[PDB]
Amino acid sequence: EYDALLVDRFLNILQDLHGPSLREFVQECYEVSADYEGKGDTTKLGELGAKLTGLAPADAILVASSILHMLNLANLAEEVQIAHRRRNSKESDIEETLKRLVSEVGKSPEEVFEALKNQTVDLVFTAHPTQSARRSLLQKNARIRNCLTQLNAKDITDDDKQELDEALQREIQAAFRTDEIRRAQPTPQDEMRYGMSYIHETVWKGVPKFLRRVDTALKNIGINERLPYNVSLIRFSSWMGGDRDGNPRVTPEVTRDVCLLARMMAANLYIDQIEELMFELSMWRCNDELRVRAEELHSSSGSKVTKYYIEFWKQIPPNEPYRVILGHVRDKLYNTRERARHLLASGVSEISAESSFTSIEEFLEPLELCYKSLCDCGDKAIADGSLLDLLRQVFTFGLSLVKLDIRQESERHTDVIDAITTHLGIGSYREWSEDKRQEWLLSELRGKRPLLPPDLPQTEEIADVIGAFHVLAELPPDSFGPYIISMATAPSDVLAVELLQRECGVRQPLPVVPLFERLADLQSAPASVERLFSVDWYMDRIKGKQQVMVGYSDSGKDAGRLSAAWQLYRAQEEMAQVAKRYGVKLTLFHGRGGTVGRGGGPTHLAILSQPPDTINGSIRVTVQGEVIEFCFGEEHLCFQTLQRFTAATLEHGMHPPVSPKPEWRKLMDEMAVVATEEYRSVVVKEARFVEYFRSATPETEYGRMNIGSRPAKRRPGGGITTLRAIPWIFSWTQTRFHLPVWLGVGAAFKFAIDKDVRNFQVLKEMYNEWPFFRVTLDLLEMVFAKGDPGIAGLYDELLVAEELKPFGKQLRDKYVETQQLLLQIAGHKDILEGDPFLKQGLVLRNPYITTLNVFQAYTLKRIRDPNFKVTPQPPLSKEFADEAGLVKLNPASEYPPGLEDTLILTMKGIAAGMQNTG
Amino acid sequence: EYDALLVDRFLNILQDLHGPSLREFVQECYEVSADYEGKGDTTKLGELGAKLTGLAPADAILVASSILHMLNLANLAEEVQIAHRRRNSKLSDIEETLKRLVSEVGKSPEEVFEALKNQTVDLVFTAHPTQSARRSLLQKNARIRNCLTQLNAKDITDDDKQELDEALQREIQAAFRTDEIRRAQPTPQDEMRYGMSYIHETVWKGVPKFLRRVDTALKNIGINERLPYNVSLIRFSSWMGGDRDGNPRVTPEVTRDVCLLARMMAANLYIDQIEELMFELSMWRCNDELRVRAEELHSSSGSKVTKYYIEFWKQIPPNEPYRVILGHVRDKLYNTRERARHLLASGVSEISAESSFTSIEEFLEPLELCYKSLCDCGDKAIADGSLLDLLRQVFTFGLSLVKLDIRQESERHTDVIDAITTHLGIGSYREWSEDKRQEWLLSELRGKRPLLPPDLPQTEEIADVIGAFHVLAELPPDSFGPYIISMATAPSDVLAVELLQRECGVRQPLPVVPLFERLADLQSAPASVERLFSVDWYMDRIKGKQQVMVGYSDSGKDAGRLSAAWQLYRAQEEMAQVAKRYGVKLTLFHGRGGTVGRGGGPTHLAILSQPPDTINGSIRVTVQGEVIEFCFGEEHLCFQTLQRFTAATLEHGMHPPVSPKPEWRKLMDEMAVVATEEYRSVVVKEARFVEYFRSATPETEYGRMNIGSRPAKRRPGGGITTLRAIPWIFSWTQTRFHLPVWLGVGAAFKFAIDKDVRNFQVLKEMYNEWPFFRVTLDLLEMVFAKGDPGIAGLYDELLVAEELKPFGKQLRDKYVETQQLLLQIAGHKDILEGDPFLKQGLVLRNPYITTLNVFQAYTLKRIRDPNFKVTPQPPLSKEFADEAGLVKLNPASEYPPGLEDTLILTMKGIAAGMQNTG
């Protein structure tokens, strides 16, 4: 009923503002596409684009803008109802997962309590260019959901309801009367501030609330104490500013900028918390250690640290001890924030080191001192209030709020080192074999003599690499995470960084993690890791700890979806074995995206689908682009997301899934090869593919959304091979074909059952009994439920060259064949059977996505072929009667009047309907 | 049910921190006291007095603190159960009042609309010394109420409830382990910020919300229009920093600090609002006027205003016009709050006049442009959103937030004018008769030649009068309200200030209002007013607008409750008629306050009790000290308080109470005389009364609470005549005798029914029909129901000398005869027979108030009588075993150790139990 509420209110506003005609048109468009949805009639689609094409440039944008906002309001009305259904329950949460591990799994609470203390989940916010949404519009969503949630409260006045309704009205109209298009790419610093706003508005306050829940959950299974505040049960990191992989606009200056901005934000968040705490901690009873400190600070009036906040210092009573300690802490915090602002504006501050907080230890000392004071006075109840929450923030967020991960292409380090060994007349590091590089790199690392000559000639690219290590060397180590190597292949790559890092003067080096992103590299991966582990120098370096990252984006782009997901499984599984053998604690970093074809899917299931005994309280997962909004857009969402990662990781540690029987293994090994062959037979071993690709899907238009700062093609020259993973998945998502997601799965299924009809009962046994296999298929079913090959055929009809058109039909035949087999194996007769609501959800959502699909296909044609002329209709908006101000929102467009805006809106809208950008 | 939740939790905490024996002791006191309550056995009181007197210094406090906290928790639970019951009675107010005035009164919705546009209710915040509570404790009340409110919600989980409970637990214990006693007198600037916290935290956001309800209520009677945003339907003024009467600590400099501090606070609130509004108004459609200005500001990079927020200007995209204007509006606001800071912190500022906002019209210029733009583009729905709420704040709060009322004694201006006539050798102004004073003042006022010599000899008082005017001369006129003359008697006082104001160079002078505080002045009052009109000079000055204040505090002190209340009635009545005849809009400023003995009572009833046709949408009322927390302590409270004032005043204008029958009037005049004489025969015409007074009540110990900056006596000489109304009322309120509240009412009733038995059928006939008479008798009834003459008798025992003792017993015979005569006229057999819930609350509260009544009397004894012997008990607190850090919280008490802090806690406690300080 919620979407009938929002769609009906939008339409009244559409009519009120533009005239009934246009409102009828948007409504007629619904039913023409609903006749396609209902019966399957393909003739409908042609008739619909007949209408859309002739529209005025102002009306065209209007129609496209309108379908966007209705499709968006359909999403908000679903989120609200999802939230309502979850709440009305009174997959699993944290308190249930404890009670289960104690009851059913037969574990002791002290084992569960122990397991907890050792657990640490690290969610890494990144700025992967998958968020078309202007923040301005996002904020409006939160209010719309909020007006909608309250509106449907149980107890409420007629007046309160009548006024919340008015509030909902104007909020919708505000969103509609804003330009939904970003008119210039963000800077990396913008990207960072954008993502920090989640840390501010939901994560900051929402961490101690989840933790106190974990306290309550611990008490319900008998544990009589709270989770010790130095436990980092959950942490947060960022790539916003650090990941420069294929993004030259992330310069050494940008990294320094972000690092300091973070410290600023942090200090300012703490200042606010400390200040509320000073109003609360009014109590006079303190223990001895604190009294002494409080009496030093009282007499010295702050120990002369600020002279700002000096008004406060004189008039503070003596018998308010806690207020004096915190008063000092807050004076110090202001300095820390101000020293950052000066270091950002000038690079040097007048404000000294020990007039501010430099280390996390320095900051914790007075805080814990307050805690122990309050405990020693018997007021541990008082202590476990806002004070406890703060302490947990300090261990969870620290002084720079979020740690920064640095990531650079593998081959870029090679170019530096080769420039070095060339200048120095030692030969070409690029030309050496891998074993020689290791031997050379290892001599240097052991050696006591400098290598990098200052007079080294440098390309701009060699400059950026060294200049990055330079910025790393001057910034506090507690602001960084690890250094990640994109395209990491062999132990050379890791050692090459360890060296460059040392030879650029990084006094305390960042731990080096490789990112195995491709199929070959994930196979050779445990072999890579064992070589490193076996080196005496490297082993002393890492000290029992090694982190390694696995990319789900570029994996599935190399092999198929099936082969990549399997290779990712056993590459985790084997590395954990090598690490266990060498006594190294492996910590897996998961490069998961939002879409299914990049490791997307429910959080608790994604964990459950990972090899047993390869987590054990230590895991890092990326949260990419729009996924931050999905997970941390609202207070409850943030809390719920912390719940999933924590409860899953816990269970998975103590009660791991079933290891795959050898039957299952061999069959996955065999299918994956067939699947890879079939996938690569389409994307790699086929000349005319790239021409069909850039023709049938809106691939080449993705940059026009101005989403992120990254040029999303690694190099103009060239081909599909350099096209980033995100616009890839995006291209096939708009068209609703989802090619890279299912290609190869059908062949692997067909191979297995044709090889031996017995295997049908083996596939069935795996889908029932093996979490990994089940989750993978289930996720594929969801995709196919969001799939319509009839739409893919519609792009093929209007845009694809004639010779290739049968190639397209050949592909759609595989789509249907794959779906067909998938269902049989799963034991489903119908698609999205065994799942209500998400099928219901696709019923109202679809006719609009169909309308946009049609709109976009024709809008693409109109752009590409000047010859496709269509007879222009009369204007529909009462606003744009006679000679158009809205179209002028796009100053200089490469395309004819209103064609680029119509296109962008079709992309944004279809992405909203799919609830995914790419 | 709600109090049982809280009181029990405190006890568990009390037992948890100090051991079982103490907990049982506090419980023993209850039932001992309860035994007195349910039977009336005066022996139990003395019994308890034994126990409480022997206690250790640490335990004497802990007990008083514990009764206080429980007494407060009982108040808290009652506030939450009142709010609950109110919301249930919406599943009168303003939407009902509009409907009733249309259907029942037969007014047109247009007439109703119009009378609202012409209404204005000015609520005056004052710092009258009646808030014992430290603000750090009050904040904790709020959290307790909240935690208690969420605890008893309909939808709530088991764990949510478990944690809300844990949050309630620690919040009580926090308040308990805080020193409740303010250890130092506030400054007037401390007092002012204290009051402004209410403006910030509830009144700021709460005004626009209330007006939006008035919108909806207008639409429910079919108006189809919003109450135009320029209507100030409700306004807020302040005395905090302006009221000088009897407080030499309110210097000219205090007034200057308060005036700037406010403008700082105001800009700082407008900045936070504007910043949100910029986020919101992201629309691109604007009208021509806005577009022009928008491009001027955009292309000039801000129009050169601040250089702060310069990072924002470069950021600003072109087609976001609203953010552009608003951005400049913000820049200009930053300057305004800084300029105040520099004007406060030192003589002047670098920041110019026209780099900031100087006039309210200059601030409204760009905002209204935005509003008209959005309406012009058809987005008025958006315009009525957050923008509308701000605009209404601009009209309601202006650039200074609240207007400062200056108030000074009548004779203090006389002193100045006598120093001038003596210095210039014109004569002695003081010795001149009233008609001569008027004649001379008017010569000077008509004259163009200066008067005040700069070489004038001044005492310190005279330098505080002239120096104050000098401050008003400098500060912008829109920061002040009127100049209020306390002890106003004749038209000379008003003309005297009009002259001093001009002769001190106050360029645009404050309008002069006289405060008629006493009986003789309220009688001459309408004649004074007519005299002040009919003067052709004074008529041109006021220009049809005259305000006069009536004092409810100092009236009852002069004449007695009934005789005051009645003279106050016809004071307003006749002044109205004079004003009406002269074509003058009389605005009445009512000086009320908390206690019933100072014009206290329910807001809508007080306004009902006021004479017909003496309001007409123009009124001001004092919200004194602790009453501010009573009205504006919570969001819901603030809304409810604007509701009563707006609905009562509107209704009273268009649907007046009845005029009294001539029979009633004559009886009131006759009874007034009788009541006055009876009341004065006790407090004036009895030599030994003043000795009895400072003996049977803790009147003299008032100053030890450190409530206000104002010394509670207007200097030692005078006796009772100089003791301010507040510590006066407080004294009888502690002892639960309430002497000034009911003394004379018995004698007035007895006289009336004895003069003619027919009058009994009149006195009832009045109570049933007359709003004035009924409200006064009911408010009396509430007092008596909070009254216990058995307690007054317990103070008389332990404290009053043996000769004065029967005098005390004579008064107690008047108490009973009065309460008896009251109930016979009210048609009640029992006391609070018509009020079931207010009577219930006094059932659980009373035994704690009784326990503190006993504790106080004996504690007063130990101070005054060092020959009083009592045998000490063993320590009850496990915290204080052997020889006490708590009693050392008093630096150097004039009384024996722990006797002052115990005496104070018994006053604050009893104060909470009566829900009134004084």
Biggest pleated-sheet summary of chain A: 8 strands, parallel, barrel
Chain pair with largest interface = A-B, 49 and 51 residues
Cα-based radius of gyration of chain A, to the nearest Å: 29 Å
- The portion of residues forming beta strands of chain A comes to 5-15%
Main sheet of chain A: which strands, in order across?
1-2-3-4-5-6-7-8
Query: How many domain regions of chain A?
Result: 3
Helix content of chain A: 55-70%
User: Count of DSSP E strands of chain A?
Assistant: 8
Subcellular location (chain A): Cytoplasm
Active site (chain A): 128, 557
Cofactor (chain A): Mg(2+)
Subunit structure (chain A): Homotetramer.
Give a concise summary.
The structure is cut from a larger assembly and holds two copies of chain A (about 900 residues). Chain A contains 39 helices and eight strands.
Q: What does this protein look like?
A:
- Chain A has 3 domains: 1-86 and 133-181 and 662-706 and 716-914, no CATH class; 87-131 and 187-263 and 401-656, no CATH class; 264-400, Phosphoenolpyruvate/pyruvate domain (de novo design (two linked rop proteins), Up-down Bundle).
- By secondary structure, chain A is mainly α.
- Chain A starts with a helix and ends in a 5-residue tail after the last helix.
- Chain A has an 8-stranded parallel β-barrel, surrounded by 6 helices.
- In chain A, helix 2 (20-39) packs across helix 38 and helix 17 (410-423) crosses helix 19 (460-474).
